[PDB]
Amino acid sequence: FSKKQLKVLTWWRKASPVSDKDGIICDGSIRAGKTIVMSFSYVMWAMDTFNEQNFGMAGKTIGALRRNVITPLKRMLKSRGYRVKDHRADNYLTITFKGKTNYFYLFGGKDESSQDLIQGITLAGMFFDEVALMPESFVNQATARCSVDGAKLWFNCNPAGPYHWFKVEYLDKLDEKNLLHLHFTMDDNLSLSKQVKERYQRMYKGVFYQRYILGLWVLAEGIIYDMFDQDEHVVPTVPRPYEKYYVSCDYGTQNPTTFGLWGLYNGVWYKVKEYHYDGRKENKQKTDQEYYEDLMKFIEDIEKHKFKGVIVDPSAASFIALLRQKGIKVIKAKNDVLDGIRNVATALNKKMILYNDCCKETFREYSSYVWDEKAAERGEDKPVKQNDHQLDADRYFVNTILFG
Ligand SMILES: Nc1ncnc2c1ncn2[C@@H]1O[C@H](COP(=O)(O)OP(=O)(O)OP(O)(O)=S)[C@@H](O)[C@H]1O
Ligand SMILES: [Mg+2]
């Protein structure tokens, strides 16, 4: 373990000069070993400091908490001699060690079970994985539940805007809450090679570099996909031998409706051609029948055994139903926005995707998709939802197929 990771494991112990504190904030870069030592240190602290008490562990969703935190935490605890009994249906664990036993309830920031349970339960310590991605209403409610004598608060996240509730309320008022704060760059994880560290550097440019590599709380302003480059990302519209295929779709009778034909060739997805229909501009809105008829004329040429399905947003259920009637494979897209943008940026940085030069509406949109300046100075990083109709399709595709 690194010096900073070992400070997370030991701050709470009796010999430590900082064991006074009411809690701890660990933030900074990706792949820095924050979550894994933080969650491991939390259970150690709890099993040592208490007996027969309730504890909380929160994530964006409970399934997120389970992927990032809970599954690798079990192998860690089981290996150190901590017996765990996971009660998967009821969302809590029973960790037990040297005659002592405690209870660790699992929470989601958005979940309905989690609002119901958190309001009533009375905890002796709370932990937050990806705290910036959680509602502030949730953490204020959950911190009040830490009523038991000698409770400690643990927070864990990557950076966001400098006007974000957690940065402004929790991190700037650090001495006011008597919280400890360690900040993790990627050098604080010794398990990474210098070869592997510099690979992660190449995945991010711009705001996302400063946030997810340097660990800085910097402001999302101006153009979103600034790293897009018509030198690097545009290729000629000349045929190629594509292995698999997809069609990505942003649907709207009300606004423009887009398709995009994506094709795999030499481990790179090419946006082969675009469909762009604006009902307002054309002054004739299209029906689902008319749109389905267009998707067929749009994929007439390609070979149906390679065509692997249509990625489409869940709020087009009128359209989704008709495609399944007619017998098309229809993937409900991973809708999450900031996570989709960040992943598309990575795809451009690494050239996982390229564009044929006939995606002319896509390039226009690349040069106008900008951050909501008004919202970003509240601590809410969002796109301005205007001329983002190809880019939403491109986002669904990249997020749904390319990334996990
Ligand atoms: N002591 C260790 N031995 C081996 N691998 C480790 C060790 N500490 C951390 N790692 C690995 O380092 C990587 C990052 O650890 P995490 O705790 O998941 O990072 P993180 O800081 O939570 O990253 P984000 O912000 O959630 S992407 C994982 O692949 C871990 O398995
Ligand atoms: Mg983490």
Numbering used by the authors: 14 to 417
Give the article text.
Structures of large terminase in complex with ATP analogues were obtained after soaking in a high salt cryo-protectant producing a different crystal form with improved diffraction quality (Crystal form 3), as described in ‘Materials and Methods’ section. Structures of complexes with bound adenosine diphosphate (ADP) and ATP-γ-S provide the structural basis for ATPase activity. While these structures reveal very similar overall conformations, there are differences in the molecular interactions in the active site upon binding of different ATP analogues. Secondly, the hydrogen bond formed by the P-loop lysine K47 with side chains of N169 in the apo and ADP bound structures was not observed in the structure with bound ATP-γ-S. Instead, the side chain amine of this lysine forms salt bridges with the β- and γ-phosphates of the bound nucleotide. Likewise, the presence of the γ-phosphate causes N169 to rotate its side chain to hydrogen bond to an inner shell water molecule of the catalytic magnesium ion. Superposition of the structures for the full-length protein and the truncated protein (with bound sulphate or ATP-γ-S, respectively) positions R421 close to the α-phosphate of the ATP-γ-S. However, similar to the observation for Sf6 large terminase, the observed overall conformational differences upon nucleotide binding are insignificant.
Most dsDNA bacteriophages and viruses utilize a powerful DNA translocation motor to package their unit-length genome into a preformed procapsid. A central component of the motor, large terminase, consists of an N-terminal adenosine triphosphatase (ATPase) domain comprising ASCE (Additional Strand Catalytic glutamate) and lid subdomains, and a C-terminal nuclease domain, connected by a short linker sequence. The nuclease domain is responsible for cleavage of the genomic DNA concatemer at both the initiation and completion stages of viral DNA packaging.
